[PDB]
Amino acid sequence: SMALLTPDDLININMQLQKADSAVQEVTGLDIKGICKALYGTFSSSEKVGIVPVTSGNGIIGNFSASLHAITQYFGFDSFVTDMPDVSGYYEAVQNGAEIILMADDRTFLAHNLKNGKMANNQPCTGIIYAEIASRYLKADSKDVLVVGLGKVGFPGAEHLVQKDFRVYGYDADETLLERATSNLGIIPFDPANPKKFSIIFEATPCANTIPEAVLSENCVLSTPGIPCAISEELRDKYEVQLIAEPLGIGTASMLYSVL
Numbered sequence: 001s002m003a004l005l006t007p008d009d010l011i012n013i014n015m016q017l018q019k020a021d022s023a024v025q026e027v028t029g030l031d032i033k034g035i036c037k038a039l040y041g042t043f044s045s046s047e048k049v050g051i052v053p054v055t056s057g058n059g060i061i062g063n064f065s066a067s068l069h070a071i072t073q074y075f076g077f078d079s080f081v082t083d084m085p086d087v088s089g090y091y092e093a094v095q096n097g098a099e100i101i102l103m104a105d106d107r108t109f110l111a112h113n114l115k116n117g118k119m120a121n122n123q124p125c126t127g128i129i130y131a132e133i134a135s136r137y138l139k140a141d142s143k144d145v146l147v148v149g150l151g152k153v154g155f156p157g158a159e160h161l162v163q164k165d166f167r168v169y170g171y172d173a174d175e176t177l178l179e180r181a182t183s184n185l186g187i188i189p190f191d192p193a194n195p196k197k198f199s200i201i202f203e204a205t206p207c208a209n210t211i212p213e214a215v216l217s218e219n220c221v222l223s224t225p226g227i228p229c230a231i232s233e234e235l236r237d238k239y240e241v242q243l244i245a246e247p248l249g250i251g252t253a254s255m256l257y258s259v260l
């Protein structure tokens with residue numbers, strides 16, 4: 001089984017990004033650019049970005065390149081999408097003066113800066129930024145964070161939180177992933193039968209309704225790249241949960257600012 005974006009996930013990406021940016025600003029005091037500035041020290045200066053469609057594996061995803069095109073323009077990069085896909089697309093991008101290559105198959109989504117040699121992988125970049133946003137919740141009043149999902153996105157997020165000196169509690173429905181996180185990162189295994197309430201939650205799972213009512217507190221932040229939503233509308237509304245959740249753009253920003 002594979003977790004991949006679908007074209008419907010990406011509809012009106014510009015509005016999705018705007019809403020996410022507003023939520024990030026409300027929660028943390030910074031916009032997405034400022035968050036990236038905090039993580040990486042970098043800012044955009046109209047670097048040329050070539051976006052190469054890839055027919056590998058399950059193939060080109062409807063809306064995917066177009067969404068990257070919009071996302072990169074939104075953050076102030078000089079981006080373009082190649083006509084040709086795959087290697088012929090890569091050549092086209094380089095020939096047309098791209099400084100950064102953005103491309104993805106079903107297992108890897110990367111950004112490679114050809115000018116300074118830095119390369120980013122989407123999975124850790126997404127995990128780090130969504131964890132960073134969570135952790136900057138201005139009205140948190142606590143350094144306890146719950147991390148749900150300790151896979152390719154969730155593990156690097158948890159690791160980041162541990163480095164930033166939060167008290168990280170982690171849960172993954174796969175006992176082996178949980179054990180790997182506790183023994184490699186030193187996080188506290190969360191026991192769902194013995195819950196406690198959090199004001200900061202980071203979720204990175206491909207599953208609905210992973211966040212149980214018992215861990216919620218009023219006005220808590222739930223920062224989640226996971227798709228579909230980790231929390232029902234009912235529980236979101238009931239606790240006035242401040243949700244940060246967007247399908248591509250926040251993690252893409254994290255990749256781009258990390259290679260500047």
Ligand SMILES: NC(=O)C1=CN([C@@H]2O[C@H](COP(=O)(O)OP(=O)(O)OC[C@H]3O[C@@H](n4cnc5c(N)ncnc54)[C@H](O)[C@@H]3O)[C@@H](O)[C@H]2O)C=CC1
Pocket residue numbers: 003004005122123126148149150151152153154171172173174177204205206207210224225226227228246247248249250251252
């Ligand atoms: N918004 C965005 O920009 C992006 C979103 N994603 C999405 O993030 C999610 C996670 O991606 P990866 O870490 O690569 O997947 P992964 O498969 O590496 O890890 C997911 C983890 O969640 C765990 N899990 C599943 N159900 C659970 C439950 N009920 N409770 C606790 N843990 C549970 C799994 O055991 C697994 O360890 C996916 O839905 C993926 O589509 C990924 C990249 C970027």
Ligand SMILES: N[C@@H](CCCCNC(=O)[C@H]1CCCC=N1)C(=O)O
Pocket residue numbers: 003004005052053054055056059060061062064065104105106107109122247248251
């Ligand atoms: N080769 C396709 C793209 C495949 C991308 C697959 N990866 C995902 O869907 C990741 C991208 C990061 C956000 C969540 N999931 C294309 O070029 O259109």
Ligand SMILES: [Mg+2]
Pocket residue numbers: 126225246247248249250251252
């Ligand atoms: Mg995102």
Ligand code: NA
Pocket residue numbers: 203204205206207208209210226227228229230
């Ligand atoms: Na989810």
